[PDB]
Design a protein around this ligand. Sequence first.
Ligand code: HEC
Ligand code: HEC
Ligand code: HEC
Ligand code: HEC
Lengths: 220, 220, 120
Amino acid sequence: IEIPKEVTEEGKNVYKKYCAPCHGEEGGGDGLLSRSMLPKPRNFTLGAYKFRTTPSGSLPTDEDIYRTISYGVPNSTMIPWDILTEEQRASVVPVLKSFSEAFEYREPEPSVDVGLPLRPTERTILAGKKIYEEKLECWKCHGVEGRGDGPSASEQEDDFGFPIKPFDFTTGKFKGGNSPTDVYLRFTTGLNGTPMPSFAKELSDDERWYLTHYVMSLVQ
Amino acid sequence: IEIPKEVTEEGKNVYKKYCAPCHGEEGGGDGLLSRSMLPKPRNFTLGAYKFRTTPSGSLPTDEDIYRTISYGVPNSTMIPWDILTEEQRASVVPVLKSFSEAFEYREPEPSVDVGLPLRPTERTILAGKKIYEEKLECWKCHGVEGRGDGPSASEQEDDFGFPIKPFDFTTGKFKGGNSPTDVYLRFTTGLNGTPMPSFAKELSDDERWYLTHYVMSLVQ
Amino acid sequence: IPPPDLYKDTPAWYQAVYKDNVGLSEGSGPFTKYFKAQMLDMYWQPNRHYEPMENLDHSIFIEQERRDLCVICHEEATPGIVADWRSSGHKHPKSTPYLSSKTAQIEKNVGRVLDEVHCF
Ligand code: HEC
Ligand code: HEC
Ligand code: HEC
Ligand code: HEC
């Protein structure tokens, strides 16, 4: 439904009861249970969201945040919050936005246009294999099979100073969603706060569908 | 890009050169090669399109037709036409629309709202298994595993009078697209012209995501 | 090296009545003008009697070198031909030491790399 811009008392309470234990009382990702948690809960104060429909460096839209709250983040303790009502999940969006000054000064960039997903073929997969292994050498961080055991894997770090070793995605549980549109979105938007950049500039729309098709090919 | 409402000479020629051999000179699905082709090429004169974003019984939007042309239809001779230009594929949309009087009298119904795809879990899959096997008995046409070998499978027929035995979808090559959103769309819109109906009324939005998750579970 | 020619060391009158492409409009041999070829001579003797397709234009798939579309369509139009081809040594020419060895010599002779032999 409609996500408010205003902060409400209900929004404070929902965050307090269901989000503060991990993300912290002030959204610093420093709840008590964050000391022993891996991956670390998001520090909302930086305004850096991994999963957006906006280009690299931009803030998330209010709908981007509501989507992540509803769907959750696989390969982490970030469960789906479908257990909460539509309004409850929408009332905490401004609470998360109030943790970062960047939301008050800049406006989120326009959402990218997905377009029509290209038909996967033997041709598109091999064109993505070429990009993955030769043109951009994604096996550096992710490995030849995408297991997350490449040479540069163990040394990767957040912009928050935390180790972010790329998880094995051959299970098919992508953090932003396991849809072909979801994976294409990640390559078109980039993951803010992580060494995983946007390839909207290095590759065309068609080439990122080629790359998406090969990435899905690595799933079991 | 922009799909015209007007019929052009270029649109006539593109259909003539690339579509008439199968779909017929007047869109009756009666090209010469249709006599030996299975599945039969679509008879556009009925205004019945399998793959829409509109509810059951409605016409397709101009974007629905352009999408099917670009992506193609797996498990059939309907190849993707990405080989053709953006404008060429858009100029044949009105040509296909001119084959059926229904396009001139009625306006296509509003596109349905997909919403947010629910997170697949062990719980959602079992709730879809219950619907698939008990509440709606989809194994009648599709079989227990979705192989297309149910008791009522061989006897199914088109609204055009042709046998339509549900293809084995355990390969994952769905005719409308293999995305979780695509499969959810089919259950929310229904396949016009086939005994595969819409379940937008029998099931809620959440229950069709449960059903979608179980259908994807049957893929290998 | 001269391109392969089935009619090497044959007189021009012999090639004119056996190799030169008439359609189904004529026969073959010294009595080519006394009869017309049977329909299947398009396939039995292609050089002399083959004629192009007339139903679905294939030029655009050749003109843009869309080898992929040959398979995507004929996978569903003629599944038997694709099933044979996918199982042949032309699809997997480097799958055994014997196949890899013969393929390597062919690559040198044709100046090309052959990871597969396609319908194209
Ligand atoms: C501990 C079980 C948590 C609870 C309680 C909440 N969240 Fe969470 N969240 C958690 C982790 C470990 C992560 C990072 C996952 C990763 O690997 O990246 C997150 C992340 C988020 C995000 C990230 C959005 C983005 O980076 O693009 C959001 C918007 C978020 N969490 C929201 C959120 C809300 C609204 C919560 C209360 C209902 C909440 N989280 C609770 C761990 C935990
Ligand atoms: C080191 C700088 C990397 C390079 C080079 C590539 N990737 Fe990456 N990737 C990296 C990190 C640190 C992360 C985040 C991991 C986490 O736990 O948050 C990622 C993420 C991905 C994903 C997952 C997307 C999702 O929604 O979960 C994918 C599918 C992915 N990366 C693919 C990918 C491709 C195609 C690359 C070459 C163009 C590539 N990665 C390079 C680190 C690095
Ligand atoms: C023979 C190789 C064909 C050519 C040439 C074209 N089409 Fe086709 N088409 C073909 C078949 C066998 C089918 C039915 C597939 C099935 O199993 O349902 C179709 C279907 C379509 C549709 C259907 C849309 C719907 O039902 O929702 C459309 C819109 C369509 N075809 C368009 C189309 C166009 C524009 C073509 C010229 C570029 C064209 N087709 C050529 C077989 C063949
Ligand atoms: C007989 C009346 C059927 C019943 C009962 C169910 N399905 Fe069906 N389905 C049927 C036909 C004739 C077709 C079209 C086949 C073709 O070749 O065009 C379908 C199609 C589907 C699909 C494929 C969707 C796609 O995009 O390709 C799916 C995934 C599907 N049907 C699922 C499904 C479910 C979940 C059912 C129970 C609610 C169900 N089918 C019942 C015939 C019949």
